[PDB]
Amino acid sequence: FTKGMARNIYFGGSVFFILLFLALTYHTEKTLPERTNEAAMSAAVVRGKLVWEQNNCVGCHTLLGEGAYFAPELGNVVGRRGGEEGFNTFLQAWMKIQPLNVPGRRAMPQFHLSEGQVDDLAEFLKWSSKIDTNQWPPNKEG
Amino acid sequence: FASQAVAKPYFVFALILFVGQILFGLIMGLQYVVGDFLFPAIPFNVARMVHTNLLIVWLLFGFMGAAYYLVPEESDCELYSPKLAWILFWVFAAAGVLTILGYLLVPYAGLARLTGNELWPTMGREFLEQPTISKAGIVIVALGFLFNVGMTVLRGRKTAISMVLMTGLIGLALLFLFSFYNPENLTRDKFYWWWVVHLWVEGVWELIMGAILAFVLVKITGVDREVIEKWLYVIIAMALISGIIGTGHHYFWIGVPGYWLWLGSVFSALEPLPFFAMVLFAFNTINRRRRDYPNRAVALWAMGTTVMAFLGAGVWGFMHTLAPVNYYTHGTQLTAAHGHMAFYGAYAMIVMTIISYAMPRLRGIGEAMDNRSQVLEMWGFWLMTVAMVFITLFLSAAGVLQVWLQRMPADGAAMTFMATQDQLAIFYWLREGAGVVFLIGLVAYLLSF
Ligand code: HEC
Ligand code: HEM
Ligand code: HEM
Ligand SMILES: CCCCCCCCCCS[C@@H]1O[C@H](CO)[C@@H](O[C@H]2O[C@H](CO)[C@@H](O)[C@H](O)[C@H]2O)[C@H](O)[C@H]1O
Ligand SMILES: [Ca+2]
Ligand SMILES: [Fe+3]
Ligand SMILES: [O]
């Protein structure tokens, strides 16, 4: 069991699994349009992503459980606050009342967002909840 | 060799930045429980990106330093250009401090305007909060770096250590390009985010880490280079076997196929192996020494690094890598418990290990410090190492209770996010204590120079 043998397991066995991975992604990236519902991915859903990106919501929150653990999960906040019909109006009020300023409670900043910005946000968050996320989370609370 | 003293600044600035990291840790740690602490001046999300971007930045400075140190010795020739090594340092260090101050002095949406993210949107993703310009800067540096130490291996000996280390570093910089690809499709975005984070920390960085450990074990134990380099190749092979498909453990609940649940859970079960090898690798070679080494701390660091990495990455990694478990823990204080030990045990400790080796012989003190500095390093070691096992325990507690209250019950019995967080408060205070002890232990470690 020489140093030439061990060095080849690393060389060959990794080239194998890179391909297998890259082959595995190629397939996966074909199923995406259907699992994510790319039809429903309007320029609103997309502009909403950028608002999300631009104010670093992920630095307090999680989205499909990825992010920061300071504030609630938001991939499923729709079904918790007014559902698909009443969610936007909610986020509208919710974004402009921050910070609540109840002492010693975790704060959210005021982001000075336009109603068009907050609406795309809502559209982005709604589209996100309707992604085939293999039945995650367990429940409504995130 | 004499050009190895360009690794000295890299090592110091790494430790400087390492102190910045722990402070902002401590702030956030407190914001958990005193919600409006430093609000609205420094919101939690700003402290967090400073905390984590200091970690990622001080680990690179730490990895580069190690290469600037150990690649001359391995190549049996002087560094290709010590001019470059210093020019890059200052660029990188300027680039780092500016980017950090950007987070701190301007509102993030403003910083996105200022640096003009609209043209090339890459901001606002976890660990990749830096402006595009800053990423570009990091790549330039990482290219200058690669080239400089890349040439040194060509014009000199080609030991396995030096080769693998170059692979890991090349691979580090390549994968970091995916920080520029920022899909409009959220699930597409997440898929390719894990090519940066996971293939770094569970693939390509394990080569960096392994290589340094092996380089350190050659010098302090005096064991045959030929069995060390053999063992090295085993550990690496096991890393890329388990880890490349093992990526799938991040692909459960983000909107990609369910077949990843099997693939990710099967291959991830294997990812603690490399780490288990690492401890056997340390313990044997350090146990069959042709040498009692004048710096007793290095041996402690090398053995500890391998254990802590096994506990954090391996054990804590396994505990929640199985889709059935991961489902209830995904994005919980448990995830934070693991990340902390796994990052610290693997990469913080390995940077400190090689510093503990090379620093005296970068100041020309000797192979070791005197007995003062040595019993301090080792005090620091233990305070920090033991501080962090508590940090992970306390947070593991939170995470388990949190799964209990919020995650497992069905709609209605499931307690609210912000309501369960109130139950967890004690653990979070205990964690702040552990965090303080840690800062003490870092200061102990730091006084040993
Ligand atoms: C884009 C920049 C952001 C969006 C969109 C949202 N946030 Fe936050 N957030 C934070 C805290 C501490 C709370 C809890 C508030 C309380 O209960 O006192 C929240 C809450 C929300 C909610 C309501 C979710 C629910 O189910 O109750 C939504 C819809 C929401 N946030 C959206 C904190 C922070 C924070 C800390 C510095 C940041 C940067 C953001 N939030 C950003 C966004
Ligand atoms: C010592 C005191 C420390 C404190 C008080 C602290 C606190 C924190 C906090 C509050 C977060 C954010 C939690 C959230 O997202 O909601 C965090 C994140 C993180 N910290 Fe620390 N930290 C400390 C030290 C460390 C150390 C020593 C490391 C060394 C490796 C480290 C690595 C990380 C990493 C990787 C994250 C991102 C974790 C994730 O997303 O899962 N931290 N820390
Ligand atoms: C030194 C090596 C490792 C480091 C630094 C590390 C670090 C991290 C970090 C920081 C996260 C959370 C990031 C985020 O969501 O922002 C994470 C997630 C995770 N890690 Fe690792 N890890 C390592 C090795 C491993 C090992 C080897 C395994 C499997 C045995 C493991 C299993 C997991 C799992 C299952 C998650 C997902 C938690 C979630 O669902 O969000 N990790 N890791
Ligand atoms: C070594 C083990 C490797 C196993 C790899 C394959 C794992 C696939 C198993 C399914 S993953 C996940 O499991 C969940 C059950 O915990 C399943 O949840 C089920 O029950 C939940 C309540 O308990 C409920 O919220 C869901 O709507 C219900 O579908 C979930 O669907 C499934 O994706
Ligand atoms: Ca996270
Ligand atoms: Fe991983
Ligand atoms: O991971």
The resolution in angstroms reads: 3.2
Taking the C-alpha atoms of residue B6 and residue A106, their distance in angstroms, rounded to an integer, is 45
**In a 3-state reduction of DSSP, which class is residue B383?**
helix
Chain B residues 127-186 with a CB less than 8 Å from chain A: 129, 160, 184-186
What is the CATH classification number for the domain harbouring A87? 1.10.760.10
Taking the C-alpha atoms of residue B271 and residue A4, their distance in angstroms, rounded to an integer, is 24
Chain B residues 402-431 with a CB less than 8 Å from chain A: 406-411, 414-418, 421
Q: How many domains does chain A have?
A: 1
- In sign, the C-alpha dihedral spanning B253, B254, B256, B260 is negative
Provide the terminal-to-terminal Cα distance of chain B, rounded to the nearest Å.
22
CA dihedral of residues B24, B56, A60, A46 (deg, nearest 10)? 150
Length of chain B: 449
Contact B111, B45 (CB under 8 A): no
Method of determination used here: X-ray
**Rg (chain B; Cα; Å):** 22
Determine the Cα angle at A60 with ends A56 and A63, to 5°. Answer: 80
Contact A6 B237 (CB under 8 A): yes
**What residues in A contact B229, CB-CB < 8 Å?**
3
Contact B308, B349 (CB under 8 A): yes
Contact A54 B112 (CB under 8 A): yes
Ligand 2 test: best mutation among B28, B127, B338, most atoms within 8 Å of CB?
B28
Instruction: Give me ligand 1 centre to Cα B350, in Å.
Output: 37
Tokens (6 digits) for B178: 């995916």
Determine the Cα angle at B306 with ends B301 and B307, to 5°. Answer: 100
Count Cβ atoms below 10 Å from residue B8 Cβ, excluding itself.
17
Tokens 């990812």 belong to residue = B271
Taking the C-alpha atoms of residue B170 and residue B188, their distance in angstroms, rounded to an integer, is 25
B51 is in an annotated binding site: yes
Q: How many domains does chain B have?
A: 1
CA A15 from centre of chain: 32
Count Cβ atoms below 10 Å from residue A4 Cβ, excluding itself.
9
Q: How far is CA B222 from CA A27, B226, B288, in A?
A: 49, 11, 9
Structural domain of residue B445, as residue ranges? 1-449
Tokens 């938001």 belong to residue = A74
CB contact A36 to B (< 8 Å): yes
Q: Whose CA is nearest to atom 33 of ligand 3?
A: B317
φ, ψ at A66 (rounded to 5°) = -105, 135
Q: Whose CA is nearest to atom 1 of ligand 7?
A: B198
User: Is B124 a pocket residue for ligand 1 (Cβ < 6 Å)?
Assistant: no
CB contact A132 to B (< 8 Å): yes
Taking the C-alpha atoms of residue B353 and residue B297, their distance in angstroms, rounded to an integer, is 8
Tokens 């690669």 belong to residue = B146
Spatial CA neighbour of B311 closest among B281, B343, B353, B288: B343
Taking the C-alpha atoms of residue B65 and residue A28, their distance in angstroms, rounded to an integer, is 39
Q: Which ligand number lies closest to the CA of residue A58?
A: 1
User: Which positions ≥6 away from A59 have C-beta within 8 Å?
Assistant: A67, A68, B44, B45, B46, B48, B49, B108, B126, B129
Tokens 């693998």 belong to residue = B164
User: Ligand 3: residues whose CB is within 6 Å?
Assistant: A 66; B 126, 201-202, 249, 268, 271-272, 309, 313-314, 317-318, 320-321, 326, 330-331, 335, 338-339, 342-343, 346
Taking the C-alpha atoms of residue A122 and residue A96, their distance in angstroms, rounded to an integer, is 14
**Rg (chain A; Cα; Å):** 21
Contact B195, B221 (CB under 8 A): no
Taking the C-alpha atoms of residue B260 and residue B247, their distance in angstroms, rounded to an integer, is 9
Tokens (6 digits) for B115: 């640096």
Taking the C-alpha atoms of residue B28 and residue B39, their distance in angstroms, rounded to an integer, is 11
φ, ψ at A110 (rounded to 5°) = -85, 130
Taking the C-alpha atoms of residue B206 and residue B209, their distance in angstroms, rounded to an integer, is 5
Q: How far is CA A82 from CA A77, A85, A87, in A?
A: 9, 7, 5
Determine the Cα angle at B376 with ends B374 and B380, to 5°. Answer: 125
- Exposed / middle / buried, residue B324 (Cβ in 10 Å: 0-12, 13-18, 19+): exposed
Taking the C-alpha atoms of residue A64 and residue B84, their distance in angstroms, rounded to an integer, is 43
Instruction: For B246, name the nearest residue in chain A, comparing CA atoms only.
Output: A21
Provide the H-helix boundaries in B176-258: 186-198, 205-221, 225-246
Taking the C-alpha atoms of residue B58 and residue B62, their distance in angstroms, rounded to an integer, is 6
CA B115 from centre of chain: 27
User: Is A57 a pocket residue for ligand 1 (Cβ < 6 Å)?
Assistant: yes
Tokens 């002087």 belong to residue = B78
Contact B1, B53 (CB under 8 A): no
Q: How far is CA B51 from CA A110, B46, B90, B99, in A?
A: 22, 9, 21, 13
CA distance B148 to chain A (A): 25
Q: How far is CA A63 from CA A10, A69, B72, B202, B218, in A?
A: 36, 10, 46, 23, 46
User: Is B394 a pocket residue for ligand 2 (Cβ < 6 Å)?
Assistant: no
Which residues does residue A67 pair with via DSSP β-bridges, in sequence order? Answer: A62
Taking the C-alpha atoms of residue B160 and residue B408, their distance in angstroms, rounded to an integer, is 49
Q: For B387, how many CA atoms within 13 A lie in the half-sphere containing its CB?
A: 21
Q: Which of B24, B170, B187, B228 to mutate to test the interface with A (most CBs of A within 10 A)?
A: B187
What's at A123, amino acid-wise? E
φ, ψ at A67 (rounded to 5°) = 145, -120
Tokens 């390492």 belong to residue = B18
Taking the C-alpha atoms of residue B75 and residue B280, their distance in angstroms, rounded to an integer, is 27
Which residues does residue B128 pair with via DSSP β-bridges, in sequence order? Answer: B125
Q: How far is CA A77 from CA A43, A63, B24, B159, B216, in A?
A: 21, 10, 29, 55, 50
Contact B222, A66 (CB under 8 A): no
A57 is in an annotated binding site: yes
φ, ψ at B125 (rounded to 5°) = -120, 140
Taking the C-alpha atoms of residue B267 and residue B245, their distance in angstroms, rounded to an integer, is 6
**What residues in A contact B408, CB-CB < 8 Å?**
138
User: Which positions ≥6 away from B196 have C-beta within 8 Å?
Assistant: B127, B128, B175, B176, B178, B179
Beta strand extents in chain A (DSSP E only): 62-63, 66-67
Contact B88, B144 (CB under 8 A): yes
CB contact A68 to B (< 8 Å): yes
Taking the C-alpha atoms of residue B409 and residue B397, their distance in angstroms, rounded to an integer, is 18
User: Which positions ≥6 away from B416 have C-beta within 8 Å?
Assistant: A141, B406
Q: Which of B39, B45, B238, B259 to mutate to test the interface with A (most CBs of A within 10 A)?
A: B45
For ligand 6, an ion, list residues with CB under 5 A. B 198, 202
Taking the C-alpha atoms of residue B88 and residue B97, their distance in angstroms, rounded to an integer, is 14
Contact B188 A32 (CB under 8 A): yes
Which residues does residue A62 pair with via DSSP β-bridges, in sequence order? Answer: A67, A73
DSSP for B115-173, please give it. Answer: TTGGGS---SBTTB-S-HHHHHHHHHHHHHHHHHHHHHHHSS---HHHHHHHHHHHHHH
What's at B211, amino acid-wise? A
- Exposed / middle / buried, residue B155 (Cβ in 10 Å: 0-12, 13-18, 19+): exposed
Tokens 């880890």 belong to residue = B243
Tokens 């043998």 belong to residue = A5
Which residues does residue A73 pair with via DSSP β-bridges, in sequence order? Answer: A62
Spatial CA neighbour of A73 closest among B194, B414, B183, B418: B418
**What residues in B contact A124, CB-CB < 8 Å?**
186
- Exposed / middle / buried, residue B174 (Cβ in 10 Å: 0-12, 13-18, 19+): middle
CA distance B376 to chain A (A): 35
DSSP-derived pairing of the beta strands A62-63 and A66-67: antiparallel
Chain B residues 109-128 with a CB less than 8 Å from chain A: 109, 112, 117, 121, 123-126
User: Is B33 a pocket residue for ligand 2 (Cβ < 6 Å)?
Assistant: no
User: Which positions ≥6 away from B133 have C-beta within 8 Å?
Assistant: B115
**In a 3-state reduction of DSSP, which class is residue B66?**
helix
CA B244 from centre of chain: 18
**In a 3-state reduction of DSSP, which class is residue A6?**
helix
φ, ψ at B128 (rounded to 5°) = -120, 40
Provide the terminal-to-terminal Cα distance of chain A, rounded to the nearest Å.
51
Instruction: For B414, name the nearest residue in chain A, comparing CA atoms only.
Output: A141
Structural domain of residue A63, as residue ranges? 1-142
Count Cβ atoms below 10 Å from residue B358 Cβ, excluding itself.
24
Spatial CA neighbour of A102 closest among B39, B87, B54: B39
Contact B244 A68 (CB under 8 A): no
φ, ψ at A72 (rounded to 5°) = -60, 165
What is the CATH classification number for the domain harbouring B98? 1.20.210.10
Contact A44, A119 (CB under 8 A): yes
**What residues in A contact B28, CB-CB < 8 Å?**
70
Taking the C-alpha atoms of residue B354 and residue B368, their distance in angstroms, rounded to an integer, is 13
DSSP for B254-289, please give it. Answer: SSS-THHHHHHHHHHTTTHHHHHHHHHHHHHHHHS-
Contact B313, B346 (CB under 8 A): yes
**Secondary structure letter of residue B211 according to DSSP:** H
